[PDB]
Amino acid sequence: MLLPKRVKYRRQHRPKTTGRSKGGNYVTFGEFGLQATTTSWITSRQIESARIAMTRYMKRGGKVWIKIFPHTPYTKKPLEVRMGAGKGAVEGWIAVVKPGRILFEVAGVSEEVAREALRLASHKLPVKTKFVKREE
Amino acid sequence: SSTKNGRDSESKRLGAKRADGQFVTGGSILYRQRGTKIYPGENVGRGGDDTLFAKIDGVVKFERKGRDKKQVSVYAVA
Amino acid sequence: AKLQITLTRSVIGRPETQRKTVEALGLKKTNSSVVVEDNPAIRGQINKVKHLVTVE
Amino acid sequence: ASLKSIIRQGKQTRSDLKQLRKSGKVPAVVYGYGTKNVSVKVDEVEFIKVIREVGRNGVIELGVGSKTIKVMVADYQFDPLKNQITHIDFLAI
Amino acid sequence: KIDKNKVRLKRHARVRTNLSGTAEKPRLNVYRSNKHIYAQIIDDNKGVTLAQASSKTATKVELATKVGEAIAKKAADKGIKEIVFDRGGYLYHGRVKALAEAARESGLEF
RNA sequence: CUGGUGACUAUAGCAAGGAGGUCACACCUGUUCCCAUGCCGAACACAGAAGUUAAGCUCCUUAGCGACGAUGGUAGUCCAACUUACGUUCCGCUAGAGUAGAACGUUCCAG
RNA sequence: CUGGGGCGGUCGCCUCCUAAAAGGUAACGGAGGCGCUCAAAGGUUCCCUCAGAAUGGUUGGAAAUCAUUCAUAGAGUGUAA
RNA sequence: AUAUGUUAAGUGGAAAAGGAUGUGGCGUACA
RNA sequence: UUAUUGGAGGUAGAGCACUGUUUGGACGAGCGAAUUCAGACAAACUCCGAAUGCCAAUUAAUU
């Protein structure tokens, strides 16, 4: 349940989401990584589901890193209400991902057990992915 | 089911009023500001509310005054 | 007396800023031409509306 | 066998650089000591393997305009999505 | 463990922000030391120095007056009366006013 | 290769080590004489035989931290064609890198 | 006034964001404040310089007071920004 | 109409995550 | 309207030097966010910073 301990403002604007990724396009902690090829929003619940599956397959084999964090919240309106009369209330926290960013990095295992722990975790995410190694 | 916001004050027309290289009179306002974001130069005065005005007739000149600071001056035309 | 510019496309549906550059050159209607000498300011007008006229 | 090279003359347009990368050739700049700033052209594959032997800091010995100059790789640009090198900087000590 | 004159220059800078010397009203600068006293007339608007005078007893106070009429007579030869006095960042008392007093009384209009 | 006083974006700074003087700057031994401290003749100003380069201050060396940084690429972008994300033509970042750089210097006093 | 009308909320002035590097610009869009105070908290002249203080102390649940160095202003500026 | 190539689905003439030695192009002893 | 020479103004992008938020290690002042080595985020963060547009010069040519 990743969520910032405190924020200055609880009602923000939504990110642009159009363009290419800004930073974090390389592997710097582990031996392998999972790279994204499309744009989408990632919620804390999705990150939780996608990392528990990876941990189970590896059987506590090595280290796993999460390079994304849901910094931005989003509001939602009640059910069956009319337009206007103020803004909604916080519902959850999301993160913006664009083509060329790494989501998960693992280390301490082989190249085969690592290519199967990331495939079982890429089906929990709403974005397309790819297998990438530390570039030589 | 209500809003707590919805207040705002009238907008003040701040900024420069004359351009560089332009001819002005003795009492022409050159820059309205809050505080001193641009300092007065030769033949220039700072008003009560930080307004910059000329004192003679001449061309306007926006120049730099030190590292990360600006001024405005007025030189008589010859 | 060095260049010849003729208007091929019309001005309907174009921004008002471009319709004013077609007036400084001396073009009234479609397919109208005019003769002027190659100046530094003359080519600055054609370049702005090079998608509408045909310089020769 | 020292690798081959080409000299980019003038200034290329956005399209010229894109078509050059499409062919399989990557642009490069050499600004090391003892040389001037000249734009060169080297095959992407020809560089990918010659760098294998010399490694990261080995001596390239690139030849510009019939004059071989001993040089090394200082920094380069890489595209992670399409996995295509974009730019290479050669530094001659 | 401090420098006496290093800090004095900062006080002089604050004084010379609203006090300047033009051709008609040249600034009169006064530099002081442990033994000798100095003086100088400057025209900053262009950057020329017009006059110069210096001592080189009684706390060097009588010597300070020795420069008062000394420089005033120099200026009197060129017939310039209007001037603007510059303390230099030194408190206006003792020897500093002697140099000014010795020059003011010699038909020099401040 | 000095002192005084100005002009300019630290390329003028910060460090680290070295050399030098009683002609000048300072340190320096005094509180009767004008004036001064909310403990300190500490500072301010004073009355001024000696005592000394240990620091203040200087001209000399070194690129360590700061500062100045093109060329070539990249992102973005005005205009125009396709179509919604892709072509073409002008402009042109940030960051990083080869790099400059241990100031330049008017008037002026006496040497 | 009002995403029909009621009910609820709101009505003048000040600062910021939305506002697309001149100025201007909407919504029942996102955040606060005002209906004063000061006879010195005003004018003028001369002086001065702050938080935090890797340690020492008449040793009081490390921060009242005093002492020496790090100190690019991280202090203050009657009252919102 | 001319020149050189691709697609066999009526694709062309409506849509996704995913699933397939369907078929082209350019690069790195097997029964 | 255009070419040229000038100026004012912090958006896109970028960045972590300020205010925040925040991942993985190293060092014992009680050691994951007022020490250090890496990697990220922001309409109300900015050491930096365009393309355009805007204000001017009884400057030049076409209207």
- Determine the strand fraction of chain C and express it as a percent band: 15-25%
State the helical fraction of chain B.
under 10%
Helix content of chain C: 25-40%
Shape descriptor of chain B: elongated
Tell me the span between the first and last alpha carbons of chain B.
69 Å
- Strand composition percent of chain B: 35-45%
Gyration radius of chain C, in Å: 10 Å
Q: How does the helix and strand content of chain B classify structurally?
A: mainly beta
Rg for CA atoms of chain B: 17 Å
Count of runs of 4 or more consecutive helical residues of chain B? 0
The helix/strand class of chain C is alpha+beta
Main sheet: strand order of chain C: 2-1-3
Name the helix and strand elements of chain C from N-terminus to C-terminus, one letter apiece: EHEHE
What strand line-up does the widest sheet of chain B have? 1-3-6-5
Biggest sheet of chain B: strands, sense, closure? Answer: 4 strands, antiparallel
**Largest interchain contact:** A-D, 8 and 3 residues
Total domain units of chain C: 1
Main beta sheet of chain C, described?
Answer: 3 strands, antiparallel
Please count the helical segments of chain C: 2
Instruction: Give me the oligomer status.
Output: part of a larger assembly
Organism (chain A): Staphylococcus schweitzeri
GO molecular function (chain A): rRNA binding; structural constituent of ribosome; tRNA binding
GO biological process, one term (chain A): translation
Keywords (chain A): Ribonucleoprotein, Ribosomal protein, RNA-binding, rRNA-binding, tRNA-binding
Topology:
The structure is cut from a larger assembly and holds chains A (136 residues), B (78 residues), C (56 residues), D (93 residues) and E (110 residues).
Chain B: E1 15-16, E2 23-24, E3 29-32, E4 39-40, E5 44-46, E6 52-54, E7 58-64, E8 70-75
Parallel strand pairs in B: 4-8
Antiparallel strand pairs in B: 1-3, 2-7, 3-6, 5-6, 7-8
Chain C: E1 3-7, H1 16-25, E2 33-36, H2 42-48, E3 53-55
Antiparallel strand pairs in C: 1-2, 1-3
Chain D: E1 6-7, H1 14-23, E2 25-30, E3 38-43, H2 44-54, E4 62-64, E5 67-69, E6 72-79, E7 84-91
Parallel strand pairs in D: 2-7
Antiparallel strand pairs in D: 1-3, 2-3, 4-5, 6-7
Chain A binds four RNA strands through strand 3.
